[PDB]
Design a protein around this ligand. Structure first.
Ligand SMILES: Nc1ncnc2c1ncn2[C@@H]1O[C@H](CSCC[C@H](N)C(=O)O)[C@@H](O)[C@H]1O
Ligand SMILES: Nc1ncnc2c1ncn2[C@@H]1O[C@H](CSCC[C@H](N)C(=O)O)[C@@H](O)[C@H]1O
Ligand SMILES: Cc1cn([C@H]2C[C@H](O)[C@@H](COP(=O)(O)O)O2)c(=O)[nH]c1=O
Ligand SMILES: Cc1cn([C@H]2C[C@H](O)[C@@H](COP(=O)(O)O)O2)c(=O)[nH]c1=O
Ligand SMILES: [Mg+2]
Ligand SMILES: [Mg+2]
Ligand SMILES: [Mg+2]
Ligand SMILES: [Zn+2]
Ligand SMILES: [Zn+2]
Lengths: 406, 397
């Protein structure tokens, strides 16, 4: 039995096998290492509805729990981004004298804080307690529960209809989309929409950014697959917008079928996907081959540098990096440690390959010869600020969209 | 009508009539001197450069006030630092640094730099941030002297400045003297493709002498011995492109350059007929806007303008929109408050005046900031107020 599609039930053709992987966000102490969870990370395309998806679901409680370490507000580019998201929704998707904004996955409340500060009624759903708490400390209302049909329906009954349900980097995390969209159907008001933004399949294929494939990214959405999924659930894809964040995303707007006229952007992006051949399983096999080439070149490079007696360190202990280190077999012999600004990631070992994580100050004591940039979506900001590294002769190693030394 | 780049003949395709200076806001008792010029635009048939047909005398003509641009220029500085200012002792020069937001980031990274900014007031603001500034125009002579005193530059950068300078040959001769071996000129300005696609004719006003495209920039570069080697679309200021020019043969154009030139072929942007279609669309916008405002006044509704943009002068004057059609314009800029807008003399009032009381319609001149403005005016929406937009077409929201 190959996979069955989690949207429509039909058969999924697997095209990339990334091997045995840990949970991306589970950093370890030495005592945890024997007990570490692993699963098989592989990606396939449903031949009927085109949805690209992982072939095994990781249980949601293992990934989303009290001590989930990713706080959205750590990143300044994302603070700016979500302020603008709040402005967009406030400007375009509110009706009447008491509108209501709901967010799935509001994390530390980055976006909804602005909605609150504008005096608009709102509610977040965030089952991870630690981040929920920080959101709450900013004045956001947050239910520490998973958004799904039942929870959404109950909120319709207490809080009334929602003008918009927004989700960033959350919808692709949720295999149970039918239940989310049943929820949305119950909760949304008459001109209500679901607006969600996630890592875009088109960007992943174009950039060979395979580190975007990890436990929390169950779906790799495209406009083609979203339009088909919406239809199945009695919704309709009515707007799309490309965003540059997180290595390349699309924001999808779904309305109940018939309620709105799809914008011209929708057809334009579909034509782009057709140009890219995104829906041809062959294009996806070519991507899988390019992934294997990146692995080969990156391991060869790190292996040479090790042989030359150079010091190589990683920069940014990203969630994505677990896929790289584990798929490529990169341990401490090839990358001595990883520098990271996140207090809870520091003084722990990275998932699966157990690279020690050190604070960002450790980068300078002394500077290494090479820095492997896992935090590649922040390349300009990082490379610009680390002047002394470059003055000491330091070189950057990048692996997106290909392996190169800068 | 002669091309300011190559000297060949320029074919006019849009005449926006008599216009004032776009930032010459009048006190109520000096509306008698008022300067007007003829604002029109043409394409050089030889090099393709799109440009105003009459230059506004330069003698008659604060970046960090906008949060969006402060954020943008932080990122520009990081881009330049990360990618072009590598080597032992690099040097970035900026043409038109204004209050120095961008170069402040360069200075704080410890990188040698120099801004050119002939406006003394902003130049001093830039100095107060630690930016090294010369209160001079960048041109062949001044650039050459900088080469002598400071050595070669890795980058010469300009934002919203190159398109204001008719004398580009002098700028590029300057860059040729001043740049190092692998040096580049990087400039970003409002993009002709976006103006045509959006019918955003309010981008056409005294300060914007050129409406650059990849095609016209490639031809200009080659004329001056440079080469278009990179491009990047930017969303700021209603749609821009950042062009990267290297000395001919020094670098290999990126795949982006080709892709943008393909977009321009798809758009037909180098066919005068396409530019005529744009002109016809501009006339339609005028017709539809004036018809709407006329009807709304006839229906007894109250209409206020929102944001006294420099660009808005083009709109009010071309469309003949005076205070009978729009009562005043609210604006957050102190230097503009309590003055009359150029040419059509719309009164300008602080933001607080919008809610005293709320009008029935608000005509959005600051259309680049639609979300930010509409998001913050919640009570206006709750009270049934509606927004009138004219980009990319006339409509009520
Ligand atoms: N079914 C569900 N309902 C609500 N939130 C969920 C969920 N499943 C996962 N989440 C939350 O979704 C978030 C993924 S991380 C993305 C956070 C934030 N939206 C941002 O874009 O930066 C986590 O905070 C996780 O706890
Ligand atoms: N030849 C020249 N050299 C240097 N600066 C010039 C110039 N001609 C005009 N300027 C300056 O260029 C600026 C154009 S306005 C744009 C300012 C800023 N770069 C921004 O993007 O916001 C003004 O500050 C003006 O004084
Ligand atoms: C921008 C930036 C991020 N980081 C780290 C913080 C996060 O753990 C990580 C970004 O990855 P994330 O996308 O998993 O949040 O990189 C740094 O260490 N230094 C930096 O300058
Ligand atoms: C963003 C914003 C701008 N404005 C004004 C300020 C400036 O005069 C003008 C912006 O024009 P500019 O883009 O030509 O600088 O609009 C407001 O009045 N309110 C606002 O909320
Ligand atoms: Mg296997
Ligand atoms: Mg329909
Ligand atoms: Mg530092
Ligand atoms: Zn399917
Ligand atoms: Zn010419």
């Amino acid at each position: 039995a190959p996979a069955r599609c989690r949207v429509c039930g039909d058969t999924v053709d697997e095209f990339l096998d990334l091997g045995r992987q840990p949970l991306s966000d589970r950093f370890l102490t030495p005592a945890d290492t024997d007990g570490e969870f692993f699963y098989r990370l592989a990606v396939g395309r449903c031949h009927a509805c085109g949805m690209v998806q992982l072939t095994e679901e990781v249980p949601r409680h293992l990934m989303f729990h009290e001590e989930y370490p990713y706080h959205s507000s750590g990143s300044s580019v994302m603070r700016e981004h979500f302020a603008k998201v709040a402005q967009r929704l406030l400007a375009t998707e509110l009706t009447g004298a008491d509108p209501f904004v709901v967010e799935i996955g509001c994390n530390d409340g980055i976006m909804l804080r602005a909605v609150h500060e504008a005096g608009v009624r709102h509610l977040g759903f965030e089952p991870s307690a630690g981040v929920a708490e920080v959101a709450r400390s900013r004045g956001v209302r947050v239910r520490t529960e998973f958004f799904e049909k039942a929870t959404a329906t109950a909120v319709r009954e207490s809080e009334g209809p929602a003008d918009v349900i927004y989700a960033a980097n959350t919808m692709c995390h949720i295999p149970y989309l039918e239940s989310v969209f049943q929820g949305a159907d119950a909760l949304l008001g008459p001109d209500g929409v679901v607006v969600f933004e996630d890592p875009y399949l088109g960007d992943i294929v174009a950039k060979t950014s395979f580190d975007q494939i990890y436990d929390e990214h169950f779906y790799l959405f495209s406009a083609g697959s979203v339009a088909a999924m919406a239809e199945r659930f009695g919704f309709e894809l009515v707007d799309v917008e490309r965003l540059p964040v997180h290595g390349g995303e699309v924001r999808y707007t779904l309305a109940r079928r018939g309620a709105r006229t799809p914008t011209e952007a929708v057809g334009r992006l579909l034509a782009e996907e057709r140009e890219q051949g995104l829906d041809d399983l062959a294009t996806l096999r070519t991507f899988a081959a390019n992934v294997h080439t990146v692995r080969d070149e990156l391991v060869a490079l790190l292996t040479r540098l090790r042989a030359e007696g150079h010091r190589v360190v990683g920069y940014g202990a990203t969630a994505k990096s677990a896929t790289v280190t584990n798929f490529c077999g990169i341990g401490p012999d090839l990358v001595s440690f990883v520098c990271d600004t996140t207090p809870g990631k520091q003084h722990r070992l990275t998932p699966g390959k157990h690279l020690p994580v050190r604070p960002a100050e450790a980068f300078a004591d002394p500077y290494p010869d090479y820095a492997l940039l896992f935090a590649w979506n922040h390349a300009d900001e990082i490379m610009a600020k680390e002047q002394e590294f470059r003055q000491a002769g330091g070189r950057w190693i990048l692996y997106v969209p290909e392996v190169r030394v800068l």
